[PDB]
PDB file of all heavy atoms in Angstrom:
ATOM      1  N   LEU A 258    -148.041 104.706  64.812  1.00  2.00           N
ATOM      2  CA  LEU A 258    -147.776 103.297  64.645  1.00  2.00           C
ATOM      3  C   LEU A 258    -148.945 102.435  65.061  1.00  2.00           C
ATOM      4  O   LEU A 258    -149.891 102.892  65.682  1.00  2.00           O
ATOM      5  CB  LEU A 258    -146.565 102.882  65.482  1.00  2.00           C
ATOM      6  CG  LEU A 258    -145.270 103.641  65.262  1.00  2.00           C
ATOM      7  CD1 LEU A 258    -144.256 103.169  66.265  1.00  2.00           C
ATOM      8  CD2 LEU A 258    -144.784 103.424  63.843  1.00  2.00           C
ATOM      9  N   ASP A 259    -148.865 101.178  64.693  1.00  2.00           N
ATOM     10  CA  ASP A 259    -149.857 100.200  65.050  1.00  2.00           C
ATOM     11  C   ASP A 259    -148.999  99.012  65.457  1.00  2.00           C
ATOM     12  O   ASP A 259    -148.295  98.439  64.639  1.00  2.00           O
ATOM     13  CB  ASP A 259    -150.747  99.830  63.873  1.00  2.00           C
ATOM     14  CG  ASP A 259    -151.828  98.861  64.264  1.00  2.00           C
ATOM     15  OD1 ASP A 259    -152.675  99.252  65.085  1.00  2.00           O
ATOM     16  OD2 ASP A 259    -151.839  97.718  63.777  1.00  2.00           O
ATOM     17  N   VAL A 260    -149.053  98.663  66.725  1.00  2.00           N
ATOM     18  CA  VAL A 260    -148.258  97.577  67.203  1.00  2.00           C
ATOM     19  C   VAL A 260    -149.108  96.501  67.839  1.00  2.00           C
ATOM     20  O   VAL A 260    -149.676  96.690  68.902  1.00  2.00           O
ATOM     21  CB  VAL A 260    -147.212  98.088  68.210  1.00  2.00           C
ATOM     22  CG1 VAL A 260    -146.134  97.038  68.429  1.00  2.00           C
ATOM     23  CG2 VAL A 260    -146.621  99.390  67.720  1.00  2.00           C
ATOM     24  N   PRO A 266    -151.980  82.416  65.346  1.00  2.00           N
ATOM     25  CA  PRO A 266    -152.263  81.218  66.137  1.00  2.00           C
ATOM     26  C   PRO A 266    -151.253  80.116  66.411  1.00  2.00           C
ATOM     27  O   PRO A 266    -151.102  79.670  67.539  1.00  2.00           O
ATOM     28  CB  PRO A 266    -153.435  80.637  65.427  1.00  2.00           C
ATOM     29  CG  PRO A 266    -154.110  81.767  64.877  1.00  2.00           C
ATOM     30  CD  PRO A 266    -152.994  82.592  64.324  1.00  2.00           C
ATOM     31  N   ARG A 267    -150.633  79.603  65.367  1.00  2.00           N
ATOM     32  CA  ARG A 267    -149.690  78.510  65.510  1.00  2.00           C
ATOM     33  C   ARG A 267    -148.225  78.901  65.360  1.00  2.00           C
ATOM     34  O   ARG A 267    -147.375  78.020  65.289  1.00  2.00           O
ATOM     35  CB  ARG A 267    -150.021  77.395  64.505  1.00  2.00           C
ATOM     36  CG  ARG A 267    -151.478  77.042  64.418  1.00  2.00           C
ATOM     37  CD  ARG A 267    -152.015  76.371  65.703  1.00  2.00           C
ATOM     38  NE  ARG A 267    -151.724  74.937  65.721  1.00  2.00           N
ATOM     39  CZ  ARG A 267    -152.600  73.991  66.101  1.00  2.00           C
ATOM     40  NH1 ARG A 267    -153.819  74.322  66.501  1.00  2.00           N
ATOM     41  NH2 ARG A 267    -152.247  72.727  66.067  1.00  2.00           N
ATOM     42  N   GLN A 280    -146.573  98.122  55.834  1.00  2.00           N
ATOM     43  CA  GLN A 280    -147.052  97.138  56.812  1.00  2.00           C
ATOM     44  C   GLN A 280    -146.277  95.809  56.704  1.00  2.00           C
ATOM     45  O   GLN A 280    -146.015  95.324  55.618  1.00  2.00           O
ATOM     46  CB  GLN A 280    -148.548  96.885  56.630  1.00  2.00           C
ATOM     47  CG  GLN A 280    -149.095  95.857  57.592  1.00  2.00           C
ATOM     48  CD  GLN A 280    -150.621  95.872  57.681  1.00  2.00           C
ATOM     49  OE1 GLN A 280    -151.323  95.592  56.689  1.00  2.00           O
ATOM     50  NE2 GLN A 280    -151.126  96.185  58.862  1.00  2.00           N
ATOM     51  N   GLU A 335    -143.341  89.262  56.358  1.00 13.99           N
ATOM     52  CA  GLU A 335    -144.298  89.289  55.237  1.00 13.99           C
ATOM     53  C   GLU A 335    -144.826  90.667  55.064  1.00 13.99           C
ATOM     54  O   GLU A 335    -145.546  91.193  55.926  1.00 13.99           O
ATOM     55  CB  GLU A 335    -145.435  88.291  55.446  1.00 13.99           C
ATOM     56  CG  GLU A 335    -145.004  86.888  55.064  1.00 13.99           C
ATOM     57  CD  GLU A 335    -145.930  86.245  54.064  1.00 13.99           C
ATOM     58  OE1 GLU A 335    -146.312  86.883  53.060  1.00 13.99           O
ATOM     59  OE2 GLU A 335    -146.275  85.075  54.286  1.00 13.99           O
ATOM     60  N   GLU A 338    -148.249  94.957  52.824  1.00 18.83           N
ATOM     61  CA  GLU A 338    -148.464  96.164  52.085  1.00 18.83           C
ATOM     62  C   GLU A 338    -147.481  97.294  52.079  1.00 18.83           C
ATOM     63  O   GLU A 338    -146.885  97.661  53.077  1.00 18.83           O
ATOM     64  CB  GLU A 338    -149.818  96.785  52.488  1.00 18.83           C
ATOM     65  CG  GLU A 338    -149.704  97.719  53.719  1.00 18.83           C
ATOM     66  CD  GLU A 338    -151.013  98.434  54.102  1.00 18.83           C
ATOM     67  OE1 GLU A 338    -152.045  98.184  53.443  1.00 18.83           O
ATOM     68  OE2 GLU A 338    -151.003  99.246  55.063  1.00 18.83           O
TER      69      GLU A 338
ATOM     70  N   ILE B   2    -151.213  98.524  70.586  1.00 20.38           N
ATOM     71  CA  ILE B   2    -151.332  99.974  70.420  1.00 20.38           C
ATOM     72  C   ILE B   2    -152.632 100.445  69.750  1.00 20.38           C
ATOM     73  O   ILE B   2    -153.174 101.508  70.089  1.00 20.38           O
ATOM     74  CB  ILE B   2    -150.088 100.542  69.699  1.00 20.38           C
ATOM     75  CG1 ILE B   2    -149.116 101.115  70.738  1.00 20.38           C
ATOM     76  CG2 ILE B   2    -150.472 101.603  68.693  1.00 20.38           C
ATOM     77  CD1 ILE B   2    -148.353 100.067  71.553  1.00 20.38           C
ATOM     78  N   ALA B  27    -153.349  95.070  54.705  1.00 31.47           N
ATOM     79  CA  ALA B  27    -153.318  95.352  53.284  1.00 31.47           C
ATOM     80  C   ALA B  27    -154.355  96.313  52.751  1.00 31.47           C
ATOM     81  O   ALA B  27    -154.981  96.057  51.718  1.00 31.47           O
ATOM     82  CB  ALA B  27    -153.372  94.038  52.506  1.00 31.47           C
ATOM     83  N   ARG B  28    -154.522  97.445  53.432  1.00 30.75           N
ATOM     84  CA  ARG B  28    -155.502  98.470  53.031  1.00 30.75           C
ATOM     85  C   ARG B  28    -155.359  99.007  51.602  1.00 30.75           C
ATOM     86  O   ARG B  28    -156.348  99.317  50.951  1.00 30.75           O
ATOM     87  CB  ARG B  28    -155.496  99.644  54.010  1.00 30.75           C
ATOM     88  CG  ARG B  28    -156.176  99.386  55.336  1.00 30.75           C
ATOM     89  CD  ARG B  28    -155.185  98.976  56.401  1.00 30.75           C
ATOM     90  NE  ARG B  28    -154.213 100.033  56.661  1.00 30.75           N
ATOM     91  CZ  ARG B  28    -154.326 100.957  57.626  1.00 30.75           C
ATOM     92  NH1 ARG B  28    -155.386 100.952  58.453  1.00 30.75           N
ATOM     93  NH2 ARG B  28    -153.380 101.886  57.749  1.00 30.75           N
ATOM     94  N   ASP B  40    -157.693  78.142  64.132  1.00 30.21           N
ATOM     95  CA  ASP B  40    -156.375  78.639  63.928  1.00 30.21           C
ATOM     96  C   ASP B  40    -155.514  78.018  62.771  1.00 30.21           C
ATOM     97  O   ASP B  40    -154.355  77.575  62.942  1.00 30.21           O
ATOM     98  CB  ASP B  40    -155.546  78.766  65.254  1.00 30.21           C
ATOM     99  CG  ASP B  40    -155.712  77.625  66.187  1.00 30.21           C
ATOM    100  OD1 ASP B  40    -155.041  76.579  66.013  1.00 30.21           O
ATOM    101  OD2 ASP B  40    -156.516  77.794  67.162  1.00 30.21           O
ATOM    102  N   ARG B  69    -147.007  78.784  53.654  1.00 17.57           N
ATOM    103  CA  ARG B  69    -145.742  79.078  54.324  1.00 17.57           C
ATOM    104  C   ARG B  69    -145.235  78.009  55.293  1.00 17.57           C
ATOM    105  O   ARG B  69    -145.979  77.470  56.092  1.00 17.57           O
ATOM    106  CB  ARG B  69    -145.859  80.532  55.088  1.00 17.57           C
ATOM    107  CG  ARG B  69    -146.459  81.503  54.096  1.00 17.57           C
ATOM    108  CD  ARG B  69    -145.451  82.531  53.647  1.00 17.57           C
ATOM    109  NE  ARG B  69    -145.438  82.543  52.159  1.00 17.57           N
ATOM    110  CZ  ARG B  69    -145.454  83.615  51.326  1.00 17.57           C
ATOM    111  NH1 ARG B  69    -145.673  84.829  51.854  1.00 17.57           N
ATOM    112  NH2 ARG B  69    -145.299  83.525  50.038  1.00 17.57           N
ATOM    113  N   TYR B  71    -143.438  78.845  57.935  1.00 15.51           N
ATOM    114  CA  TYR B  71    -143.567  79.311  59.418  1.00 15.51           C
ATOM    115  C   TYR B  71    -145.029  79.134  59.923  1.00 15.51           C
ATOM    116  O   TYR B  71    -145.189  79.072  61.117  1.00 15.51           O
ATOM    117  CB  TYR B  71    -143.129  80.977  59.668  1.00 15.51           C
ATOM    118  CG  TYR B  71    -143.859  81.842  58.794  1.00 15.51           C
ATOM    119  CD1 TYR B  71    -145.337  82.269  59.362  1.00 15.51           C
ATOM    120  CD2 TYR B  71    -143.467  82.348  57.590  1.00 15.51           C
ATOM    121  CE1 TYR B  71    -146.189  83.132  58.558  1.00 15.51           C
ATOM    122  CE2 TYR B  71    -144.270  83.163  56.699  1.00 15.51           C
ATOM    123  CZ  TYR B  71    -145.661  83.637  57.266  1.00 15.51           C
ATOM    124  OH  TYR B  71    -146.350  84.490  56.586  1.00 15.51           O
ATOM    125  N   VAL B 112    -151.207  77.369  60.370  1.00 41.13           N
ATOM    126  CA  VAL B 112    -151.790  76.042  60.067  1.00 41.13           C
ATOM    127  C   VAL B 112    -151.944  75.172  61.246  1.00 41.13           C
ATOM    128  O   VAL B 112    -151.149  75.169  62.166  1.00 41.13           O
ATOM    129  CB  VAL B 112    -150.886  75.178  59.037  1.00 41.13           C
ATOM    130  CG1 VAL B 112    -151.749  73.954  58.573  1.00 41.13           C
ATOM    131  CG2 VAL B 112    -150.425  75.992  57.858  1.00 41.13           C
TER     132      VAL B 112
END
Side-chain angles (χ1 to χ4, degrees):
Chain A
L258 305 175
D259 183 64
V260 196
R267 315 292 277 223
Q280 179 164 64
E335 279 234 46
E338 87 176 2
Chain B
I2 262 74
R28 284 96 62 94
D40 42 82
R69 313 250 128 134
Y71 54 85
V112 192

